[PDB]
Design a protein around this ligand. Structure first.
Ligand SMILES: [Mg+2]
Ligand SMILES: [Zn+2]
Lengths: 154, 72, 50, 1337, 51, 49, 148
């Protein structure tokens, strides 16, 4: 109805065509554009969706026109994307996974229970870092006024 | 307790409870009534030789069992 | 690799030896070490609380 | 007489009852059921062709197109079992279907077609069942289970009075079709029949009779009995119909028959039928409560006085005499016998004819709308009487016409007006006590959906998913050059089928511990999944064992725990029906003789006959011997005479499954300890040297062979060559199939990895030149000794307390058990390392890695990978992988330290693969898989040329041995008819293409046989390219990864305090001590006991069969220590053949007759070699060793016949008094090791989402301190212990690193604060519009 | 949400004494206010698709 | 040593043909199939409790 | 960090369902913002406001209005109420039942040489559980200098 309101503002009945042919173009755009813009949790640009959609339309066709499977390096031949701008198309995920995903039947454990944080501070490295703070303070206790102070402010 | 010993206690409670609930329905000692308590029919003497204290006759009790077969 | 466990308290955990596993924790603080020693030691609890 | 393999070690067999049926092929369910799926049935009714004949032909809109089905074919698989298990792809075959699209024109809908379009389209790939009944799906071996779902048909259930508090049980009757409307009857609490069509609102159940066009007098004509009153005031009597307390006495003939008050008795109705009464005169009050049975008017004016279904009045009765009426009909409603239900449901029924009857039916289906006279009627008639809504299948009418006791075993697929009132007449009879209700757990109501029936239903749902495309593609454009390939996607039928085998809860991992674990796994019948119930609504209803389980499913073997009785185990001789029910063989009893024609009976047809027991004694003519024979009809088991019985059990093994048919003396164990022992036998780990059970059931050989882990000779012959990895059998001239090369190569399966991370390995038991037959075992699998199932070891056991070291359930184990390595098990772990593609660069697999200092790195090759053969330890680097990163923002006191020594930031990080903690093993395989864009490295090519020189050699070794069988097969021709004999081995063998013979068929066979050697050389030329293709080709990896290097360790685990040994009788325990060998109890021979067991487990857990096996273990090792002692002195065979024949012939009238008089002399010493450990004893399941036959067998040894010897203490040397039972129990080693259950964590990785420690032993996890461990901590006063178990030891991120510094500082004082489970909780309430905040003090 | 445990079949024996009835009665008071008042109009649904 | 006795049913009822045998002798196939109703009900109620 | 977007292996990801519910609210609010910027007819703005109100209901409690909307998984989404309420919720499953450092498990054996006040701890488990204690006592006695 957003494009339907915009189709009315650009509709010209002096051409004399029916309106159900003009606004069908805009609803073909505006539905598929918001499907392109606002449907995945990670936003893919609109043309890049059409890269997958062309790849979804072609690799389905070469599933039977070739034999068993289409290889990725075969898709470098059919579409004129040179084996790397075809590979990062299939690297992209798809509305990926929930983290209330049942593993399951363990403790009713979900996929959030087994994702580990790597960006935390493990307390062995932190007490290593803390004891390095004091082990520097004793080595800098073996220096005089000037040379320790420049080495504290370099 | 090995999970098949609590099974043993449950099964022995089952058997003992059911068998006591049956044996309470044998009405061992009673009075010689000589007449049924829903028909007034003469209950035969071999039947009281079997069960002392049958206030119901044979087939009126059979009707009672057939009525109680479902419930109510 | 198995926890060995005094045979008298097997009736207090209801723990037999057909393959039960006991989770073992460590009391870190001196307050929790003393709570362990003064309340939760297996000789301080030899009467059933029921 | 025995097989030649069977003469190596004959299991001496008790068990006096003879065997009529062999135990059939146990895997007939899986293999025979997937036979029916992937097979071309020309009258398409089974599997794939039936699915195609259901969905095809496809009509378009208005019939201007038609997609039609020709045939289908399974392609050849791209990979075999071994290649699919290596790369990890489904062992599937490409399903290609020959299709045909026919175009039509104007005025020719099926006349003149326009265009045909013949093509072979590829529509999805379907997974193939391999030779053992299993599937390869992602490399992993899956087993697709059968399902116990409820059948279609008619079901009469009850409510058991739990619906109402009044008490009254409410019988109901559901008619469940295949697809359609669940026509359900039920009773009111006040005895009024109801209907509802799809579990909707109720309607009074004469509405369904009125909509079938039955009027009120016709309804009462159906469901009632008619005594008729006439005038004066006479009622014609049925002599039986009076049973209910005499209301009015009798008035016939005036004199007497019996008077009022009392009961109508069996005396009285006898006297009324002997004195021949037919009519009685009755008072007017007797006809007051009766109900009028047909219409009645006055015949002067035709005016309605009283139609039927109306309470008769006495002025109304005299209204008929003044109407001139003679006949007055009424309904017979005895409150006990034929209660008024159809009458009193007409007394409520507001509708009276069919037009208003469909109104209530249409307003029950679709409310609100005004029911038009055609709109209501066309809904109803299509609902139960049309093939496109109400489908009742073949098994639906089979259960229908068998339930109401007809014999119309096949019929329509819809209901009829008589088919519905037959349900109501049966449900009335169930209310009236004629016959019993049906049961939820009858095995005549629970049908079996199996593998070939469940994959078909996932292929028919995918053939509606692709049908919506091509019905709407063929009606758009109708183009020619349009093929049947661009319409048919291969996706929606592949995603319907690789959902089922892929991830559905009836497609489980194959328990691969031992050959019992898999053979019980394919013969599992679980009542879960789609179609069947789940664990939620299961009861207390289907977890019980019902008497129709005899012969069909094991009463013993179910998994205990959450689903006991929900997962069953198929019995031994149990077979599935044509319709899908479980049928079990019974041998037919004639007049008085058990015949031999076995008949398989499903549980519907078992309750009709009288079936005897297999432990009934039989004469030599087949006659029963005793007059009263213990048999069993429908639910009871009473004493019937020998003429009236119909059937007998085939054998006494037929009630149990194959898991529980291996428990010796299972008669003497409880049903739950047998349930506990059948469970633990499938969790046994295979030991190093496989060891036979001394006390077996005789089933051990059959389960070993029928589970595919053995290498069974397909044909006879003599071994041309034996190897540890292959056996070459030169087939005899008898069975050589004259266009063949002569020999077949059994390629053995070496140290490969199980599903359960154990080792699967085949040891060839045969020797060189040893003649084998077909069927005979040549190589034993894992956990098999000489083609006999060998799940554990024979352990010289004792029964005594011994110092608390076997106290509650525990086991005290000798050091000799550990020294002899009887319980050492290999465990092959795979450990992979993946080089993925990160964002700032891909991860290399170099050997030059960061700071770890080139001591562990010397185990690495050039390419960063360990060598095959290397003996790793915990934390040792298996595969060196390094990952790029940034410089990572070096802190102060690192800018000073890295300026001192000057060594740079490494700039790469060291995410490499190392051995996890604790496991020390041997690297036995490394496989490098590469993406095609990535080139390779040195190790990936070194594995490749090693593979290629292996794959080219074995095909040459295929060829040079198949030639070396063919050049003797052709040599067999050159003896007769044109004979080249002395000049045969002189002329070169390549010019045996050019050798002259008398030109018969033989020289044309020589130009056939050697010409097939020319086919052997080109098939070798073609197959060497094929293993040049797949070995060299790049992997079709998951997108993102480059190099998956899959290292394969091998641990060789050994027994320790903590491992769980068990018996076969539910006697499990945990080894508590490895006592030294001098401290074990010994007898007066000095022989120490290997295992001491607690005897207190025996009287309470009443498994006496572990004491009887122990005494049969003392007898079996008694025989073996004289056969050993005679071979120790090299005794002559007159000593051996007169002892062993005596040993093989013991006890009462055993069916086993082995005569060593007709035995070769090198076979007897071979038989005595395999008996020098001990003679194996077969105790058949309910058939075997009586107690006197053990003591007699114990008296053949010089062992005391009570079973107990006098044992001396190991340490202090003084004897235990009151002598002790010793003997040989078969102890198992269960898959609960302490190497896989010990876990500890100080401080590991944490969880991201809430900052708690991770979960599980693999993730270096913590212990869950739940609700019940907190209340048991508040029940002490342990406040500070509980604060740290929610703050420091769990989640508070500041307070948990200020503790680890404080412990290393030596200060045990926490500064805890506020948990991170609670700030996450605080932000989630405040992410609602709820201002929950913390106050201030 | 009274909750009177609306489930599929005839319920068990122990699971009326195990299953609990919280909270009497004010939620049931306002639910009675609802359920005695939606016995009049037929056109009530809240779905934006249907409406 | 003595006889086993009357064996129960999941219906609460009692199977009127008792088990005249024991565990020092054996049980034949009929009595062993009779025992499994009570034992399976006992183990189900244990593992459900 | 309470509805994270963690990068898993191989390019794959894993989010929480609150991301989908907040995305639904932001979508409907941006579109309603345009539909009131555009002076649209009142029926489609009525439908947009009712949709945005429904999205706020699905975000705060997916199922109190009906029905609980499912994503590309056929279970309902976990909402904010479902993240505090429920058996798996933070109030039950994370405020008391929570995993714990300095802990471990193994099977039990008898070993009756013990007294009533001692358990038999294994040596690898006591090496693992008592790691910071071992480090403090090991460097206090100075047999190592660094905690490394
Ligand atoms: Mg236990
Ligand atoms: Zn009576």
């Amino acid at each position: 109805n957003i494009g339907l309101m915009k189709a009315v503002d650009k509709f010209e009945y002096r051409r004399g065509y029916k309106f159900s042919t003009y606004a069908t173009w805009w609803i073909r755009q505006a539905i598929t554009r918001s499907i392109a813009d606002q449907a995945r949790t990670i936003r893919i640009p609109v043309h890049m969706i059409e890269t997958i959609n062309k790849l979804n339309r072609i690799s389905r066709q070469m599933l039977q026109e070739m034999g068993r499977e289409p290889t990725p390096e075969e898709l470098a031949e059919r579409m004129l994307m040179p084996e790397d701008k075809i590979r990062k198309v299939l690297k992209i995920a798809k509305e990926p996974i929930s983290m209330e995903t049942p593993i399951g039947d363990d403790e009713d454990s979900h996929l959030g229970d087994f994702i580990e944080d790597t960006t935390l501070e493990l307390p062995l490295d932190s007490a290593t870092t803390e004891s390095l703070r004091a082990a520097t303070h004793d080595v800098l206790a073996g220096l005089t006024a000037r040379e320790a102070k420049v080495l504290r402010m370099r | 307790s090995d999970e098949a010993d609590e099974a043993y206690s449950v099964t022995e409670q089952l058997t003992m409870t059911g068998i006591n609930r049956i044996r309470q329905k044998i009405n061992a000692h009673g009075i010689p009534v000589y007449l049924c308590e829903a028909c007034g029919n003469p209950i035969p003497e071999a039947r009281r030789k079997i069960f002392p204290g049958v206030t119901l006759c044979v087939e009126c009790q059979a009707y009672q069992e057939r009525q109680r077969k479902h419930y109510a | 690799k198995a926890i060995q466990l005094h045979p008298l308290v097997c009736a207090a955990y209801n723990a037999d030896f057909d393959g039960d596993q006991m989770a073992v924790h460590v009391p870190l603080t001196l307050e929790a070490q003393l709570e362990a020693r003064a309340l939760m030691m297996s000789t301080n609890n030899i009467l059933s609380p029921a | 007489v025995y097989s030649y393999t069977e003469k190596k070690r004959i299991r001496k067999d008790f068990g006096k009852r003879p065997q009529v049926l062999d135990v059939p092929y146990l895997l007939s369910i899986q293999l025979d059921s997937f036979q029916k799926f992937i097979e071309q049935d020309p009258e398409g009714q089974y599997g794939l062709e039936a699915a195609f004949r259901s969905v095809f032909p496809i009509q378009s809109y208005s019939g201007n197109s038609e997609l039609q089905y020709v045939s289908y074919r399974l392609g050849e698989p791209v990979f075999d079992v071994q290649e699919c298990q290596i790369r990890g792809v489904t062992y599937s075959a490409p399903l290609r279907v020959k299709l045909r699209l026919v175009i039509y024109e104007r005025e020719a809908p099926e006349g003149t077609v326009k265009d045909i379009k013949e093509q072979e389209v590829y529509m999805g790939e379907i997974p193939l069942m391999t030779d053992n009944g299993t599937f390869v799906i992602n490399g992993t071996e899956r087993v697709i289970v059968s399902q116990l779902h409820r059948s279609p048909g008619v079901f009469f259930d009850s409510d058991k009075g739990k619906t109402h508090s009044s008490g009254k049980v409410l019988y109901n009757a559901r008619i469940i079709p295949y697809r359609g409307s669940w026509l359900d009857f039920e009773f009111d609490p006040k005895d009024n029949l109801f209907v509802r069509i799809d579990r909707r609102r109720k309607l009074p159940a004469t509405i369904i009779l009125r909509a079938l066009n039955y009027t009120t007098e016709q309804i009462l004509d159906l469901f009632f009995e008619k005594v008729i009153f006439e005038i004066k005031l006479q009622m014609e009597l049925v002599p039986e119909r009076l049973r209910g307390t005499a209301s009015f006495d009798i008035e016939a003939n005036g004199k007497v028959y019996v008077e009022k008050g009392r009961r109508i008795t069996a005396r009285h109705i006898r006297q009324l039928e002997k004195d021949d009464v037919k009519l009685i005169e009755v008072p007017v009050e007797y006809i007051a409560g009766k109900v009028v049975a047909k219409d009645y008017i006055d015949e002067s004016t035709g005016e309605l006085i009283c139609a039927a279904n109306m309470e008769l009045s006495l002025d109304l009765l005299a209204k008929l005499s003044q109407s001139g009426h003679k006949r007055i009909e009424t309904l017979f409603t005895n409150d006990l016998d034929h209660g008024p239900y159809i009458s009193e449901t007409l007394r409520v029924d507001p509708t009276n004819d069919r037009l208003s009857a469909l109104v209530e039916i249409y307003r029950m289906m679709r409310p609100g709308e005004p029911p038009t006279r055609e709109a209501a009627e066309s809904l109803f008639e299509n609902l139960f009487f049309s093939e496109d809504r109400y489908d009742l299948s073949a098994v639906g009418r089979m259960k229908f016409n068998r339930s109401l006791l007809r014999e119309e075993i096949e019929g329509s697929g819809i209901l009829s007006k008589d088919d519905i009132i037959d349900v109501m007449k049966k449900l009335i009879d169930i209310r009236n006590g004629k016959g019993e209700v049906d049961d939820i757990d009858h095995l005549g109501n629970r049908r079996i959906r199996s593998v070939g029936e469940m994959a078909e239903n996932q292929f028919r749902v995918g053939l509606v998913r692709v049908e919506r495309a091509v019905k709407e593609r063929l009606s758009l454009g109708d183009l020619d050059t349009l093929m049947p390939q661009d319409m048919i996607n291969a996706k929606p039928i592949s995603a319907a089928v690789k959902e089922f085998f892929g991830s559905s809860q009836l497609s489980q991992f194959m328990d691969q511990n031992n050959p019992l674990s898999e053979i019980t796994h394919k013969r599992r019948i679980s009542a879960l999944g789609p179609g069947g119930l789940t664990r939620e609504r299961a009861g207390f209803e289907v977890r019980d064992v019902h008497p129709t389980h005899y012969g069909r499913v094991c009463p013993i073997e179910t998994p205990e725990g959450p689903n006991i009785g929900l997962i069953n185990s198929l019995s031994v001789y149990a077979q599935t029906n044509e319709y899908g029910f479980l049928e079990t063989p019974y041998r037919k009893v004639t007049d008085g003789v058990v015949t031999d024609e076995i008949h398989y009976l499903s549980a519907i047809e078992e309750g009709n006959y009288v079936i005897a027991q297999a432990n009934s004694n039989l004469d030599e003519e087949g006659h029963f011997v005793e007059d009263l024979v213990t048999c069993r009809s429908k639910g009871e088991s009473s004493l019937f005479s020998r003429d009236q019985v119909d059937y007998m059990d085939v054998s006494t093994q037929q009630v149990v499954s194959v898991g529980a048919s291996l428990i010796p003396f299972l008669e003497h164990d409880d049903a739950n300890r047998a349930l506990m022992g059948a469970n633990m036998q499938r969790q046994a780990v295979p030991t190093l040297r496989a060891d036979k059970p001394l006390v077996g059931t005789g089933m051990e050989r059959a389960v070993a062979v029928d589970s595919g882990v053995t290498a069974v000779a397909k044909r006879g012959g003599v071994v041309q060559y034996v190897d540890a990895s292959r056996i070459v059998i030169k087939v005899n001239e008898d069975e050589m199939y004259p266009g063949e090369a002569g020999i077949d190569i059994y390629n053995l399966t070496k140290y490969t990895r199980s599903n359960q991370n154990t080792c699967i390995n085949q040891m060839p038991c045969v020797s060189l030149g040893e003649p084998v037959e077909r069927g005979d075992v040549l190589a034993d699998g894992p956990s098999t000794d000489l083609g006999e199932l060998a799940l554990g070891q024979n352990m010289r056991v004792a029964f005594m307390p011994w110092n608390g070291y076997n106290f509650e359930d525990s086991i005290l184990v000798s050091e000799r058990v550990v020294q002899e390595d009887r319980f050492t098990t290999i465990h092959i772990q795979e450990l992979a390392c993946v080089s993925r593609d990160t964002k700032l660069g891909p991860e290399e697999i170099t050997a030059d890695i960061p700071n770890v200092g080139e001591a562990a790195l010397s185990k690495l090759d050039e390419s960063g990978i360990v060598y095959i053969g290397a003996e790793v330890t915990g934390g040792d680097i298996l595969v060196g992988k390094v990952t790029p990163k940034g410089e990572t923002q070096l802190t102060p006191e690192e800018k000073l330290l890295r300026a001192i020594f000057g060594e740079k930031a490494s700039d790469v990080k060291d995410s490499s693969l190392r051995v996890p903690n604790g496991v020390s093993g041997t690297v036995i395989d490394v496989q490098v898989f590469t993406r095609d864009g990535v080139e390779k490295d040195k190790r990936a090519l070194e594995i490749e040329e090693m593979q290629l020189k292996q794959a080219k050699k074995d095909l040459s070794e295929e060829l040079q041995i198949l030639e070396a069988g063919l050049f003797s097969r052709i040599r067999a021709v050159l003896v007769a008819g044109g004979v080249e004999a002395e000049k045969l081995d002189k002329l070169p063998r390549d010019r045996w293409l050019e050798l002259g013979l008398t030109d018969e068929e033989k020289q044309n066979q020589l130009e056939q046989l050697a010409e097939q050697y020319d086919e052997l050389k080109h098939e070798f030329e073609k197959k060497l390219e094929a293993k040049r293709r797949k070995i060299t080709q790049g992997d079709d990896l998951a997108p993102g990864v480059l190099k998956i290097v899959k290292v394969y360790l091998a641990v060789k685990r050994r027994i320790q305090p903590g491992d769980k040994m068990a018996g076969r009788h539910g006697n499990k325990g945990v080894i508590s001590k490895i006592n030294p060998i001098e401290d074990m109890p010994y007898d007066e021979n000095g022989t120490p006991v290997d295992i001491v067991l607690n005897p207190l487990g025996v009287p309470s857990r009443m498994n006496i069969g572990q004491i009887l096996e122990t005494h049969l273990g003392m007898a079996a090792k008694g025989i073996g220590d004289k056969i050993n002692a005679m071979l120790k002195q090299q005794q002559e065979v007159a000593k051996l053949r007169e002892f062993i024949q005596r040993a093989y012939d013991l006890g009462a009238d055993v069916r086993q007759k082995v005569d060593l008089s007709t035995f070769s002399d090198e076979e007897v010493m071979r038989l005595a070699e395999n008996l020098r450990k001990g003679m194996p004893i077969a105790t058949p399941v309910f058939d075997g060793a009586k107690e006197a036959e053990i003591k007699e067998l114990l008296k053949l040894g010089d062992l005391p016949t009570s079973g107990q010897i006098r044992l001396y203490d190991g340490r202090t040397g003084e004897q235990f008094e009151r002598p002790v039972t010793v003997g040989y129990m078969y102890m198992l080693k269960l898959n609960h090791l302490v190497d896989d259950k010990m876990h500890a964590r100080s401080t590991g990785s944490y969880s991201l989402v809430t900052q708690q420690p991770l979960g599980g032993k693999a993730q270096f996890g913590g212990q869950r301190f739940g609700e019940m461990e907190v209340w048991a901590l508040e029940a002490y006063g342990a406040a500070y212990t509980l604060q740290e178990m929610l703050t420091v030891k769990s989640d508070d991120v500041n307070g948990r690193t200020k503790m680890y510094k404080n412990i290393v500082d030596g200060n045990h004082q926490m500064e805890p604060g506020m948990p991170e489970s609670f700030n996450v909780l605080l932000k989630e309430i405040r992410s609602l519009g709820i201002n929950i905040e913390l106050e201030d003090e | 949400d009274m909750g009177i445990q609306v489930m599929e079949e005839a319920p068990d024996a122990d699971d009326l004494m195990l299953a609990e009835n919280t909270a009497d009665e004010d939620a049931a008071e306002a639910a009675a206010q609802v359920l005695s008042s939606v016995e009049s109009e037929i056109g009530r649904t809240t779905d934006p698709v249907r409406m | 040593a003595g006889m086993r006795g009357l064996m129960a049913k999941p219906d609460g009822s009692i199977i009127e043909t008792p088990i005249t045998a024991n565990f020092r002798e054996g049980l034949n196939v009929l009595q062993y199939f009779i025992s499994t109703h009570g034992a399976r009900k006992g183990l189900a109620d244990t593992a459900l409790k | 960090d309470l509805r994270p977007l963690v990068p898993l292996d191989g390019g794959r990801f894993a989010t929480s369902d609150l991301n989908d519910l907040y995305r639904r609210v932001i979508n409907r609010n941006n579109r309603l913002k345009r539909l009131l910027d555009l002076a649209a007819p009142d029926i489609i703005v009525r439908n947009e406001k009712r949709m945005l109100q429904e999205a706020v209901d699905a975000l705060l409690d997916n199922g109190r209005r009906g029905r609980a909307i499912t994503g590309s998984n056929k279970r309902p989404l976990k909402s904010l109420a479902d993240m505090i309420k429920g058996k798996q919720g933070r109030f039950r499953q994370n405020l008391l039942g929570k995993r714990v450092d300095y802990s471990g498990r193994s099977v039990i054996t008898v070993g009756p040489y013990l007294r009533l006040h001692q358990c038999g701890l294994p040596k690898k488990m006591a090496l693992e559980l008592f790691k910071p204690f071992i480090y403090g006592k090991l460097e206090l006695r100075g047999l190592a200098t660094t905690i490394k």
